[PDB]
Design a protein around this ligand. Structure first.
Ligand SMILES: Cn1nc(-c2cccc(CNC(=O)c3cc(Br)ccc3O)c2)cc1C(=O)O
Ligand SMILES: [Zn+2]
Length: 351
């Protein structure tokens, strides 16, 4: 009973892969900012998080909204957990040449995020005009730090991130519970990769970012090493993630006039999806023939998290994404009812 879901997926895939000049405009704008930022005193080591991440799309229904991350390496960094929040940190410096590039943003021993953004934004804001109609926005703030608009259609969220090649902070030690699915060998390898810090609040605090580990898992997602390398070992994991993402997006669109869904994002959906991967580690539990059932397991688990108001961060297990101080009871109950409506009516949002 997959026929409608496949067609949704087919429609979505054709609009992703269709010939477009968007990635080209985005890349020339970004190479522009990278040259300009590289000449400034604080941003001399700035670089793209991934060569080829010009075409990173958070919104899976909008192929002209691009998501771009700029990375800056902070060697010998001192993290201090903020207010037992497990996920938010002050950045301090071990300062060996106490005039490290970032020192001009120090207030006390503490790295200021808002000051760093002000100059990042100001450098970008002036570099914007000296080709194309690149407009920016001081909207929202935080992360995304800067949203550019190329012409009318194309939109580029730029996020600035600190990179640390030391071992991941102690709040991750019992997370990424992939041992029964991707193996303990692979968990070790992943935790040997650097971690990233972006600004956000719940003061001058930073938050862990793991989009690179997510990408890595999704590009090597099977218990079997040959998963999805032919169509005989073809699994529906990635397609379920797509259908989860698209369902929230269409509900966020349908109900934008109200407000109850403003706090949910694809991060809540990704997180719940990887928990289901842990719960179902076998590739035979993700057979393409069973797309319909497999999607339904994801939708069932997410609804269970909403109803119990528990969805543990996949990397930091003491952090509850659905805690009532983060999203109130009336918002989860609202999203609970819309998803149950969709499931019981063979998903009208997919039309
Ligand atoms: C509302 N909100 N809160 C966060 C957030 C808060 C604390 C800690 C992390 C840690 N990060 C992850 O758990 C993570 C997981 C996956 Br899977 C992929 C990338 C990731 O960074 C994220 C992100 C968003 C949002 O984006 O709206
Ligand atoms: Zn697969």
């Amino acid at each position: 009973g997959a026929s409608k879901l496949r067609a949704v997926l087919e429609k979505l895939k054709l609009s992703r892969d269709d010939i477009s000049t968007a990635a080209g405009m985005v890349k020339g704008v970004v190479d522009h900012l990278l040259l300009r930022l590289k000449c400034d005193s604080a941003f001399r080591g700035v670089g793209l998080l991934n060569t080829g991440s010009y075409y990173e799309h958070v919104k899976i229904s909008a192929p002209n909204e691009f998501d771009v991350m700029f990375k800056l390496e902070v060697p010998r960094i001192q993290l201090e957990e903020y207010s037992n929040t497990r996920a938010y940190y002050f950045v301090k410096f071990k300062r060996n040449p106490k005039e490290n590039p970032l020192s001009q943003f120090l207030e006390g021993e503490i790295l200021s995020a808002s000051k760093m953004l002000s100059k990042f934004r100001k450098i970008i804001k002036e570099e914007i005009n000296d080709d194309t109609d690149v407009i920016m926005k001081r909207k929202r703030g935080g992360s995304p730090a800067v949203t550019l608009l190329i012409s009318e259609k194309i939109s580029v969220d730029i996020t600035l991130a600190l990179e640390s090649k030391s071992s991941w902070p102690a709040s991750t030690q019992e997370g990424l519970r992939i041992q029964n699915w991707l193996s303990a060998k692979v968990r070790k390898q992943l935790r040997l990769k650097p971690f990233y810090l972006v600004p956000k609040h719940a003061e001058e605090t930073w938050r862990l970012s793991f989009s690179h580990i997510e990408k890595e898992i999704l590009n090597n997602h099977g218990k079997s090493k040959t998963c999805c390398e032919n169509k005989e070992e073809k699994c529906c994991r990635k397609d379920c993630l797509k259908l989860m993402k698209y369902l929230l997006e269409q509900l966020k669109e349908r109900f934008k006039d109200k407000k109850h869904l403003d706090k949910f994002s694809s991060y809540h959906v990704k997180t719940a999806f990887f928990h289901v991967c842990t719960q179902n580690p076998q590739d035979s539990q993700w057979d393409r023939k069973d797309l319909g059932l497999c999607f339904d397991n994801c939708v069932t688990y997410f609804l269970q998290c909403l109803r119990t108001e528990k969805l543990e961060n996949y990397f930091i297990p003491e952090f509850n994404l659905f805690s009532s101080n983060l999203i109130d009871k009336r918002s989860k109950e609202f999203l609970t009812k819309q998803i149950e409506y969709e499931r019981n009516n063979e998903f009208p949002v997919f039309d």
